[PDB]
């Protein structure tokens, strides 16, 4: 039934602008791992990235990281479209800028050390609006590709220049920061995290469904364990992974 | 009066010295500050010696400033504190530049009369950090 859209899921590969897909559904869409592909996202955006073929992921779910799920403004439980991009272009000068307050308390032409290795050999298929991120020296900071000399999406080539300047600009209200937590930020709680996800994914992504059937959902949960185990962290991560409002007492 | 003559006190509040017209041993301390930074005085000005000479509140402060050279028998416990608090207090910019967690609570437990508040005053003064007592 129109296998052009697809469901979302987390990613085991952390490298930016990278995905992984079911192995048999490579002829269906008819494209390859190296074949750079564009992917749609609400609020009228589309981001391009590399492809790969795996098996663990179902034949109906993509794998991706929080960065693109942020620029695409989409959470799990959603679905988007896709399209191969053999018409991709070699990205010439595409200006970037350190877009955060994270720029605070720092000095040096950090552009070089943080970027040159990050872009080196990655053949990163980049489009305008990218909010990619890189980490070094006890710190983790990002940049936005503000300019696309060829527009909108292109490849990175080592010859491409970087006049690296600009003043840290203000992230709008739409996007959310990398600092905000997520499932990838926790470890050692897979069993109970899965329990909670399966428990409270329907009432927040499908409340009209509950109003459509007569069933009693839970309205109270208790978590018991020693201190310093990450319970408030789990609650905030779950809130951030569904868009539901969060209140603290 | 016979000393602020053609050398009209290039000074900095905190410079203490000896000046008299007699036995030649008396201090001259900071009490007031109309200009925040130090200046060079001039005649025709106005001064009020309404203030009264005091005790060695300043000398007690100096003894506290001596700090590490005013205690004994806790060589280890004083070295652990130094390596734990000097870096955050002296160079906060380094900690600002990176994301790392400094300490915000220290607990010292021991029998009475073992010089604990004295240690706190000795550590606050040696690093120049303000100290509040409750
Ligand atoms: N399972 C975990 N995964 C990731 N970080 C953890 C985990 N457990 C503890 N931490 C770290 O330690 C802290 C956990 O303390 P906290 O969330 O306050 O637990 P509690 O609320 O039970 O005291 C967090 O700030 C987090 O960075």
Swiss-Prot record, chain A:
Phenotype for residue 135 to C: In IBMPFD1; also in one patient without evidence of Paget disease of the bone
Record gene name: VCP
Domain remark in the UniProt entry: The PIM (PUB-interaction motif) motif mediates interaction with the PUB domain of RNF31.
Effect of residue 135 to H: In FTDALS6 and IBMPFD1; properly assembles into a hexameric structure; cultured cells expressing the mutant protein show a marked general increase in the level of ubiquitin-conjugated proteins and impaired protein degradation through the endoplasmic reticulum-associated degradation (ERAD) pathway; shows strongly reduced affinity for ADP and increased affinity for ATP; shows normal ATPase activity according to PubMed:16321991 while according to PubMed:25878907 and PubMed:25125609 shows increased ATPase activity; no defect in ubiquitin-dependent protein degradation by the proteasome; impaired autophagic function; defective maturation of ubiquitin-containing autophagosomes; decreased interaction with CAV1 and UBXN6; decreased endosome to lysosome transport via multivesicular body sorting pathway of CAV1; decreases the arsenite-induced stress granules (SGs) clearance process
Residues of the full protein shown: 21 to 269 of 806
Binding site for ATP 1: 227-233
Modified how: Phosphorylated by tyrosine kinases in response to T-cell antigen receptor activation. Phosphorylated in mitotic cells. ISGylated.
Protein name: Transitional endoplasmic reticulum ATPase
Protein location: Cytoplasm, Cytosol; Endoplasmic reticulum; Nucleus; Cytoplasm, Stress granule
Outcome of mutating residue 33 to A: Minor effect on affinity for ATP and ADP
Modified residues (Phosphoserine): 17
UniProt function note: Necessary for the fragmentation of Golgi stacks during mitosis and for their reassembly after mitosis. Involved in the formation of the transitional endoplasmic reticulum (tER). The transfer of membranes from the endoplasmic reticulum to the Golgi apparatus occurs via 50-70 nm transition vesicles which derive from part-rough, part-smooth transitional elements of the endoplasmic reticulum (tER). Vesicle budding from the tER is an ATP-dependent process.
Family under the similarity heading: Belongs to the AAA ATPase family.
Outcome of swapping residue 120 to D: Severely reduced binding to DERL1
Effect of residue 140 to T: In IBMPFD1; uncertain significance
Curated annotation (Swiss-Prot), chain B:
Phenotype upon changing residue 48 to W: Severely reduced binding to DERL1
Connected disease: Inclusion body myopathy with early-onset Paget disease with or without frontotemporal dementia 1: An autosomal dominant disease characterized by disabling muscle weakness clinically resembling to limb girdle muscular dystrophy, osteolytic bone lesions consistent with Paget disease, and premature frontotemporal dementia. Clinical features show incomplete penetrance. Frontotemporal dementia and/or amyotrophic lateral sclerosis 6: A neurodegenerative disorder characterized by frontotemporal dementia and/or amyotrophic lateral sclerosis in affected individuals. There is high intrafamilial variation. Frontotemporal dementia (FTD) is characterized by frontal and temporal lobe atrophy associated with neuronal loss, gliosis, and dementia. Patients exhibit progressive changes in social, behavioral, and/or language function.
Self-association and partners: Homohexamer. Forms a ring-shaped particle of 12.5 nm diameter, that displays 6-fold radial symmetry. Part of a ternary complex containing STX5A, NSFL1C and VCP. NSFL1C forms a homotrimer that binds to one end of a VCP homohexamer. The complex binds to membranes enriched in phosphatidylethanolamine-containing lipids and promotes Golgi membrane fusion. Binds to a heterodimer of NPLOC4 and UFD1, binding to this heterodimer inhibits Golgi-membrane fusion. Interaction with VCIP135 leads to dissociation of the complex via ATP hydrolysis by VCP.
Function summary: Necessary for the fragmentation of Golgi stacks during mitosis and for their reassembly after mitosis. Involved in the formation of the transitional endoplasmic reticulum (tER). The transfer of membranes from the endoplasmic reticulum to the Golgi apparatus occurs via 50-70 nm transition vesicles which derive from part-rough, part-smooth transitional elements of the endoplasmic reticulum (tER). Vesicle budding from the tER is an ATP-dependent process.
Effect on the protein of changing residue 25 to T: In IBMPFD1; uncertain significance
Modifications after synthesis and translation: Phosphorylated by tyrosine kinases in response to T-cell antigen receptor activation. Phosphorylated in mitotic cells.
Impact upon substituting residue 44 to R: No effect on binding to DERL1
Organism name: Homo sapiens
Protein's recorded name: Transitional endoplasmic reticulum ATPase
Protein family per UniProt: Belongs to the AAA ATPase family.
Localization annotation: Cytoplasm, Cytosol; Endoplasmic reticulum; Nucleus; Cytoplasm, Stress granule
Domain notes: The PIM (PUB-interaction motif) motif mediates interaction with the PUB domain of RNF31.
Reported impact of residue 20 to C: In IBMPFD1; also in one patient without evidence of Paget disease of the bone
Domain of life: Eukaryota
Binding site for ATP 1: 112-118
Variant or mutagenesis effect after changing residue 119 to F: In IBMPFD1; uncertain significance
């Amino acid at each position: 039934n129109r296998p052009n859209r697809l469901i979302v899921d987390e990613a085991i590969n952390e490298d930016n602008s990278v995905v992984s897909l079911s192995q048999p559904k490579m002829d269906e869409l008819q494209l390859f791992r190296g074949d750079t592909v564009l992917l749609k996202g609400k609020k009228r955006r589309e981001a391009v990235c590399i492809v790969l073929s795996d098996d663990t992921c179902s034949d109906e779910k993509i794998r991706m990281n929080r960065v693109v799920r942020n620029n695409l403004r989409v959470r799990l439980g959603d679905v988007i479209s896709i399209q191969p991009c053999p018409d991709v272009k070699y990205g010439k000068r595409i200006h970037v800028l350190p877009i955060d307050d994270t720029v605070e308390g720092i000095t040096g032409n950090l552009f070089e050390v943080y970027l040159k290795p990050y872009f080196l050999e990655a053949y990163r298929p980049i489009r305008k609006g990218d909010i990619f991120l890189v980490r070094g020296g006890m710190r983790a900071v990002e940049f936005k590709v503000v300019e696309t000399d060829p527009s909108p999406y292109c490849i990175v080539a080592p010859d491409t220049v970087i006049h690296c300047e600009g003043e840290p600009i203000k992230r709008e209200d739409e996007e959310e920061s990398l600092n905000e937590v997520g499932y990838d930020d926790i470890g050692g709680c897979r069993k109970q995290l899965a329990q909670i996800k399966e428990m409270v994914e329907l009432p927040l992504r499908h409340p009209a469904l509950f109003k459509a059937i007569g069933v009693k959902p839970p309205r109270g949960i208790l978590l018991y364990g020693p201190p310093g185990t990450g319970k408030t962290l789990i609650a905030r991560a779950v809130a951030n992974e569904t868009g539901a409002f969060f209140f603290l007492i």
